Write an enzyme that holds these catalytic residues in place. Structure first.
Site, PDB file in Angstrom:
ATOM      1  N   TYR A   1       0.794  -1.239   0.000  1.00  0.00           N
ATOM      2  CA  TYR A   1       0.000   0.000   0.000  1.00  0.00           C
ATOM      3  C   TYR A   1       0.830   1.294   0.000  1.00  0.00           C
ATOM      4  O   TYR A   1       0.638   2.076  -0.923  1.00  0.00           O
ATOM      5  CB  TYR A   1      -1.101  -0.005   1.073  1.00  0.00           C
ATOM      6  CG  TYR A   1      -1.854   1.287   1.363  1.00  0.00           C
ATOM      7  CD1 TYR A   1      -2.515   1.992   0.383  1.00  0.00           C
ATOM      8  CD2 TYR A   1      -1.921   1.678   2.677  1.00  0.00           C
ATOM      9  CE1 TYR A   1      -3.260   3.093   0.773  1.00  0.00           C
ATOM     10  CE2 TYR A   1      -2.638   2.769   3.065  1.00  0.00           C
ATOM     11  CZ  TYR A   1      -3.305   3.498   2.100  1.00  0.00           C
ATOM     12  OH  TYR A   1      -3.992   4.639   2.448  1.00  0.00           O
TER      13      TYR A   1
ATOM     14  N   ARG B   1      -4.580  -2.258  -1.275  1.00  0.00           N
ATOM     15  CA  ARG B   1      -5.545  -1.911  -2.275  1.00  0.00           C
ATOM     16  C   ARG B   1      -5.342  -2.698  -3.555  1.00  0.00           C
ATOM     17  O   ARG B   1      -4.360  -2.452  -4.298  1.00  0.00           O
ATOM     18  CB  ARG B   1      -5.494  -0.421  -2.647  1.00  0.00           C
ATOM     19  CG  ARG B   1      -6.169   0.554  -1.688  1.00  0.00           C
ATOM     20  CD  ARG B   1      -5.605   0.627  -0.305  1.00  0.00           C
ATOM     21  NE  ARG B   1      -6.462   1.271   0.698  1.00  0.00           N
ATOM     22  CZ  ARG B   1      -7.214   0.638   1.603  1.00  0.00           C
ATOM     23  NH1 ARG B   1      -7.495  -0.690   1.548  1.00  0.00           N
ATOM     24  NH2 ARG B   1      -7.665   1.332   2.627  1.00  0.00           N
TER      25      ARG B   1
ATOM     26  N   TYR C   1      -5.196  -2.141   8.902  1.00  0.00           N
ATOM     27  CA  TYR C   1      -6.399  -2.957   8.975  1.00  0.00           C
ATOM     28  C   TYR C   1      -6.438  -3.586  10.393  1.00  0.00           C
ATOM     29  O   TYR C   1      -7.443  -4.180  10.789  1.00  0.00           O
ATOM     30  CB  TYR C   1      -6.308  -4.049   7.912  1.00  0.00           C
ATOM     31  CG  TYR C   1      -6.950  -3.663   6.593  1.00  0.00           C
ATOM     32  CD1 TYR C   1      -6.480  -2.571   5.887  1.00  0.00           C
ATOM     33  CD2 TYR C   1      -7.984  -4.427   6.101  1.00  0.00           C
ATOM     34  CE1 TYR C   1      -7.043  -2.263   4.674  1.00  0.00           C
ATOM     35  CE2 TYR C   1      -8.540  -4.091   4.878  1.00  0.00           C
ATOM     36  CZ  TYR C   1      -8.068  -3.028   4.159  1.00  0.00           C
ATOM     37  OH  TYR C   1      -8.645  -2.747   2.927  1.00  0.00           O
TER      38      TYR C   1
HETATM   39  N1  LIG Z   1      -4.660  -5.725  -2.234  1.00  0.00           N
HETATM   40  C1  LIG Z   1      -5.774  -6.454  -2.131  1.00  0.00           C
HETATM   41  O1  LIG Z   1      -6.078  -7.310  -2.966  1.00  0.00           O
HETATM   42  C2  LIG Z   1      -6.659  -6.247  -0.898  1.00  0.00           C
HETATM   43  C3  LIG Z   1      -8.044  -6.154  -1.001  1.00  0.00           C
HETATM   44  C4  LIG Z   1      -8.813  -5.967   0.148  1.00  0.00           C
HETATM   45  C5  LIG Z   1      -8.209  -5.842   1.397  1.00  0.00           C
HETATM   46  N2  LIG Z   1      -6.821  -5.956   1.525  1.00  0.00           N
HETATM   47  C6  LIG Z   1      -6.215  -6.093   2.864  1.00  0.00           C
HETATM   48  O2  LIG Z   1      -5.312  -5.028   3.255  1.00  0.00           O
HETATM   49  C7  LIG Z   1      -4.582  -5.612   4.369  1.00  0.00           C
HETATM   50  C8  LIG Z   1      -3.470  -4.720   4.893  1.00  0.00           C
HETATM   51  O3  LIG Z   1      -2.488  -4.493   3.870  1.00  0.00           O
HETATM   52  P1  LIG Z   1      -1.338  -3.381   4.036  1.00  0.00           P
HETATM   53  O4  LIG Z   1      -0.699  -3.564   5.353  1.00  0.00           O
HETATM   54  O5  LIG Z   1      -0.473  -3.430   2.818  1.00  0.00           O
HETATM   55  O6  LIG Z   1      -2.197  -2.031   3.997  1.00  0.00           O
HETATM   56  P2  LIG Z   1      -2.967  -1.054   5.068  1.00  0.00           P
HETATM   57  O7  LIG Z   1      -3.313  -1.834   6.279  1.00  0.00           O
HETATM   58  O8  LIG Z   1      -4.044  -0.356   4.329  1.00  0.00           O
HETATM   59  O9  LIG Z   1      -1.798  -0.009   5.436  1.00  0.00           O
HETATM   60  C9  LIG Z   1      -0.941  -0.285   6.529  1.00  0.00           C
HETATM   61  C10 LIG Z   1      -0.136   0.933   6.915  1.00  0.00           C
HETATM   62  O10 LIG Z   1       0.609   1.472   5.788  1.00  0.00           O
HETATM   63  C11 LIG Z   1       1.078   2.734   6.252  1.00  0.00           C
HETATM   64  N3  LIG Z   1       1.330   3.666   5.145  1.00  0.00           N
HETATM   65  C12 LIG Z   1       0.463   4.045   4.193  1.00  0.00           C
HETATM   66  N4  LIG Z   1       0.950   4.998   3.402  1.00  0.00           N
HETATM   67  C13 LIG Z   1       2.169   5.179   3.899  1.00  0.00           C
HETATM   68  C14 LIG Z   1       2.931   6.294   3.577  1.00  0.00           C
HETATM   69  N5  LIG Z   1       2.517   7.097   2.625  1.00  0.00           N
HETATM   70  N6  LIG Z   1       3.971   6.567   4.408  1.00  0.00           N
HETATM   71  C15 LIG Z   1       4.242   5.779   5.453  1.00  0.00           C
HETATM   72  N7  LIG Z   1       3.499   4.706   5.744  1.00  0.00           N
HETATM   73  C16 LIG Z   1       2.433   4.393   4.987  1.00  0.00           C
HETATM   74  C17 LIG Z   1       0.065   3.266   7.225  1.00  0.00           C
HETATM   75  O11 LIG Z   1       0.741   3.697   8.406  1.00  0.00           O
HETATM   76  P3  LIG Z   1       0.842   5.278   8.703  1.00  0.00           P
HETATM   77  O12 LIG Z   1      -0.585   5.670   8.661  1.00  0.00           O
HETATM   78  O13 LIG Z   1       1.463   5.475  10.028  1.00  0.00           O
HETATM   79  O14 LIG Z   1       1.610   5.796   7.551  1.00  0.00           O
HETATM   80  C18 LIG Z   1      -0.921   2.124   7.403  1.00  0.00           C
HETATM   81  O15 LIG Z   1      -1.261   1.967   8.786  1.00  0.00           O
HETATM   82  C19 LIG Z   1      -4.129  -6.933   3.785  1.00  0.00           C
HETATM   83  O16 LIG Z   1      -3.724  -7.838   4.800  1.00  0.00           O
HETATM   84  C20 LIG Z   1      -5.435  -7.385   3.124  1.00  0.00           C
HETATM   85  O17 LIG Z   1      -6.190  -8.180   4.040  1.00  0.00           O
HETATM   86  C21 LIG Z   1      -6.038  -6.119   0.349  1.00  0.00           C
END
Ligand SMILES: NC(=O)c1ccc[n+]([C@@H]2O[C@H](COP(=O)([O-])OP(=O)(O)OC[C@H]3O[C@@H](n4cnc5c(N)ncnc54)[C@H](OP(=O)(O)O)[C@@H]3O)[C@@H](O)[C@H]2O)c1
Ligand SMILES: NC(=O)c1ccc[n+]([C@@H]2O[C@H](COP(=O)([O-])OP(=O)(O)OC[C@H]3O[C@@H](n4cnc5c(N)ncnc54)[C@H](O)[C@@H]3O)[C@@H](O)[C@H]2O)c1
Lengths: 364, 167, 366
Positions: free
Chosen positions: B20, B55, B136
């Site tokens: 992300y 995303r 999440y």
């Molecule tokens: N890709 C798909 O197909 C899909 C679809 C549906 C759901 N999901 C779900 O999303 C879940 C979580 O994925 P994820 O951890 O990659 O994403 P996330 O939970 O949306 O993001 C996690 C962290 O990324 C950090 N972040 C975002 N932008 C950043 C930036 N500009 N600078 C510094 N830090 C940044 C944030 O921390 P800060 O706010 O402190 O920056 C945020 O808390 C997956 O486990 C999955 O279940 C994925």
């Protein structure tokens, strides 16, 4: 005997192009410490060279021999003859649709096979890696865009062409989960005007990320009718309705009314992805297209998950790969039928005759 | 990022995790240049593109082609667990929940049973998160708190953009 | 009366109409009366009342023919020749070099035959250039019907289970259609590539998003050479190992398309793949291409020779043909006014005006 060997059938479903694993997937399965056997003629369905299965690392068996293995990784149900080929013990891994198929269940229990229902993987997150329906919906998301463009009047891409400006496709993805996300990805890549809708708040951020308008929620009752009102007033403006809205184990709600369809712009397509598990659009002719008076191709292709031969075989095969990763965590090459993890506990609907369906209630 | 610079050159193995932060912050375009630079330095780089992250599926996969990052080093959901252990600076570009132990190990995070990239107690896991905020979930996971598994309190692009010229 | 007649395309299994409602509007703006056949666009999904939305007179059958501009969507079959009226500005896909017989016949019908295919291929004219606009649409559509039968995705993506590789698309014989095919595959997220003899197209290939494959070796003398056809077949042998889509594009008006790829090498191509042959409407650039069908080569390369591809994206081809026709009639009715001022000094119009009011005026200043 043929423990540690897989059998991959040539799939005998009508409107089918899948094999359970393509050559690359066969190599994956080999990497997992197994040996693969595939039926002859599998390639023809999967549009891949049948000899390339051997070149990849498969015993291209003549037919029934495939059934005498450790795991029979198979796409849809065993037909009743295939049932009579199923070896007592053998881990059979397929679309079973357990609750929908009570008698099939019984027949497989009598045949004493370790049935894992690839469709009915308890749909939490690691489950989706194993879940055949994830990949099949994802196939169908892309495939909604493709089969749409097969019958679409216009481009997706708003290309300012030599002749003139293109009015773009407005891709109203209903049910942004999995297949919806893939349709959003594909259409956004094309630079078609994506508009998407899904109940869970998480999709909103995603639709917004793809330069795409999120259709707001205006539930269940009362709301179901406001969804209808959104979809009508939106159907005036949109082109490609990618109707994914399916609730697992339930028929797809009849959100796209025939009236809604006949109110749209002409030259436009509503693809029912949820066609096979209920039909989200009413006008959905299962397994065909139908053009309306007003000029919208309602494509109710029930066979969408099958419709993309090599990749469908690949991704179903990699769902199987992920299953064997959770099963055979050592990658020793025989099926460790794991019951400790919730996901395998739920997917193994029948452990060797004993009907182990379901898992304990793991709230999705 | 001034740390992360010196940390990178130290690393030998670098897992860059596209979860992300990469996408939202446009950190993929500058990452392409720095990874190319790390390549010239002779550093075993692996992008760990776990699809379900933030995303949409794929997404960041083609976004890396946009950045012109080689698909050789792009490892999409390859469970490169043994290289995980061997890696020093895992650049967790956002991605906290996609590597979150409390999603699988504890069945605790809303992303119930997420197959997270098991990189806790690697040699370094610098999680680009400008705050201890909920992703999440990110409940109680050592990736926030610990010495090697630690939140880099910077933006995804911004931190990459400094290390891009610092290293 | 200066009435533009928009027929249904009555050529068997063609899918266009001359103009869609949006484009009918543009013909109204031109200051002529606009009449469309009774639901003429049903091929391209638009009925009578859809053209009433635009504001088109629904001429009830044959009265469509009684109009001073007939924007025919393809050539008049002898049926329609008989239905045409002298003096009429018959603006159509005539294909004069493919249709010398029709030329003699429309000369007998004494019509102003404007061949929409036969626009001088220059910058300004591209908006009028129906040849390339329909080719362009067909290029996009070749990429489409390739994904209709393709095994894999174009769009490379890691899914929740497994890796989809980005498809390698080789466009061969890069006409304008080939350039748009690159743009289509590129939008979908495929590794696009292109080959042709002519260096003029490379700039566009690279821009829309592709690798222009160099001739691992004047432009005509080169194009005729034996070692050159060897070198092409070496590029083909090389790509055959890796590619996913081939778009065989080099359609010549008049001449059948040069059969580039020998059958043998198609069998040698990576399976689960497509060769969409755009050039199928005369000859086709692959040797496997039976026009009309998907011939699945036994390896699993479906060589899709869809002759009807420029028709196949019905409303688009209609919309943009309509826009080419509006474009023409803009310079034909410069004053507005609403009178068909067929120009001769404007050499592109002199091009398209293959026959005027009886006498064949073909060819034209290059
Ligand atoms: N890709 C798909 O197909 C899909 C679809 C549906 C759901 N999901 C779900 O999303 C879940 C979580 O994925 P994820 O951890 O990659 O994403 P996330 O939970 O949306 O993001 C996690 C962290 O990324 C950090 N972040 C975002 N932008 C950043 C930036 N500009 N600078 C510094 N830090 C940044 C944030 O921390 P800060 O706010 O402190 O920056 C945020 O808390 C997956 O486990 C999955 O279940 C994925
Ligand atoms: N953790 C992850 O990254 C991940 C990724 C994808 C899916 N999942 C799991 O998948 C499970 C089941 O969801 P699915 O998407 O696979 O199911 P599915 O394919 O059966 O349904 C597709 C979508 O239709 C939507 N839908 C149903 N009714 C709707 C309505 N009335 N209006 C609009 N949209 C509607 C649903 O929200 C769903 O997302 C979820 O509970 C989730 O745990 C997890």
């Amino acid at each position: 005997h043929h423990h540690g060997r897989i059998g991959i059938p040539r799939e005998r479903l009508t409107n089918e192009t899948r094999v359970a694993a393509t050559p690359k997937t066969v190599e994956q399965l080999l990497k997992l410490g197994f040996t693969v056997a595939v039926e002859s003629g599998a390639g023809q369905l999967a549009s891949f060279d049948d000899k390339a299965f051997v070149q990849a690392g498969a015993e291209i068996v003549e037919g029934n021999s495939v059934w005498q293995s450790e795991i029979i990784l198979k796409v849809n149900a065993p037909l009743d003859d295939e049932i009579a080929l199923l070896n007592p013990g053998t881990t059979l891994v397929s679309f079973i649709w357990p609750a929908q198929n009570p008698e099939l269940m019984q027949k497989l229990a009598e045949r004493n096979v370790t049935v894992m229902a690839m469709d009915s993987v308890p749909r939490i997150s690691r489950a989706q890696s194993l879940d055949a329906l994830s990949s099949m919906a994802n196939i169908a998301g892309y495939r909604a865009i493709v089969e749409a463009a097969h019958e679409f009047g216009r481009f997706f891409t708003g290309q300012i062409t030599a002749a003139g400006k293109v009015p773009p496709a407005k891709v109203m993805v209903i049910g942004a989960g999995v297949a919806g996300l893939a349709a959003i990805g594909a259409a956004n890549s094309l630079g078609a005007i994506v508009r998407a809708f899904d109940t869970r708040p998480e999709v909103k951020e995603q639709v917004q990320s793809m330069g795409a308008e999120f259709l707001e929620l205006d539930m269940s009752d009362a709301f179901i009718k406001a969804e209808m009102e959104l979809f009508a007033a939106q159907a005036k403006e949109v082109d490609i309705i990618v109707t994914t809205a399916l609730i697992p184990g339930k028929p797809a709600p009849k959100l796209i009314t025939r009236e809604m369809v006949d109110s749209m712009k002409a030259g436009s397509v509503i693809v029912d992805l949820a066609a096979q598990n209920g039909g989200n659009c009413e006008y959905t002719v299962p397994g065909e297209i139908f053009t309306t008076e007003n000029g919208v191709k309602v494509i109710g292709y029930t066979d969408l998950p099958g419709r993309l031969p090599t990749q469908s075989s690949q991704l179903y095969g990699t769902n199987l790969v992920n299953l064997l990763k959770l099963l055979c965590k050592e990658k020793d090459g025989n099926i460790t039928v794991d019951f400790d993890d919730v996901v395998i506990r739920g997917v193994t609907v029948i452990r060797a005759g004993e009907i182990t369906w379901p898992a304990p209630p793991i709230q999705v | 990022a001034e740390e992360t610079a010196e940390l990178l050159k130290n690393s030998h193995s670098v897992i860059i995790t596209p979860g992300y932060g990469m996408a939202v912050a446009q950190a993929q375009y500058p990452v392409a240049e720095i990874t190319e630079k790390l390549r010239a330095r002779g550093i075993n780089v692996r992008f760990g593109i776990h699809p379900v992250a933030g995303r949409l599926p794929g997404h960041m996969n083609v976004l890396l082609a946009e950045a012109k990052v080689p698909y050789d080093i792009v490892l999409e959901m390859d469970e490169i667990n043994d290289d995980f252990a061997d890696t020093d600076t895992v650049l967790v570009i956002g991605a906290n929940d996609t590597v979150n132990p409390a999603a699988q190990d504890d069945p605790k995070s809303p992303i119930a049973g997420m197959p997270v990239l098991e990189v806790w107690k690697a040699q370094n896991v610098i999680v680009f998160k400008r705050s201890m905020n909920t992703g999440y979930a990110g409940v109680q996971n050592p990736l926030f708190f610990k010495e090697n598994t630690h939140m880099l309190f910077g933006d995804a692009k911004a931190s990459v953009d400094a290390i891009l010229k610092a290293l």
